Symmetry: C2
Subunit: 127 residues, 2 copies
Amino acid sequence: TVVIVVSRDERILEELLEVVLKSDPNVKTVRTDDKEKVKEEIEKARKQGRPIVIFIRGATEEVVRDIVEYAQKEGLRVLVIMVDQDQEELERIYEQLKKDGVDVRVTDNEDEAKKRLKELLEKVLEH
Amino acid sequence: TVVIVVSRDERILEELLEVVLKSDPNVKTVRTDDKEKVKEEIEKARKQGRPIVIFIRGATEEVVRDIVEYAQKEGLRVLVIMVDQDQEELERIYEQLKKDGVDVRVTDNEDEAKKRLKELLEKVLEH
């Protein structure tokens, strides 16, 4: 009933939106990162009795959580397709680095990266 | 000797570059996604006998592989810091979706996403 396509890549969201619009012009589509706009459209999708595909970047874990909960409490089925193009290319880089003897550290934010880099230079700039 | 900071996020690369420039102005830095420019700078880093931090977006697995091999065959130590801010936020979304009963599919490219979405609509648009 409610399909959510999640991707940080705007170009990918555009292309998938196109695929939906050109394949079956009868399913509703909405491109927005605004939770309210989403709810407003899900409802119109209800009145018109049509399925809806939502295109979002995420990635707020709260925004996706709300949308999923909102639709479920109305008995709407929720299907999700996540597209993480980045993830997979980074994964291969990581493997090769490890493949060699490279001491690789994967950080999840600049704050963490900052700490590790400083700690790295504070101990490499030393001879 | 050679530090490579990999991140798809330009703003993160900028901030880390800043951290290096403001903390120890004696270590060489280079921001480029061009393999040749990198080699040209690694060498200058050699002549001047200084360590170097390279800031790249990647994520070509070939580009990172070459740089790592180039420096190693010169007996340079290679340390890497990868910063994947995206990955971690997507990871949490995925968990919540799974937390609920959401049938979630993670695709690694639009080609794959296209197939799965079409297959999804070809079977949902059906009553």
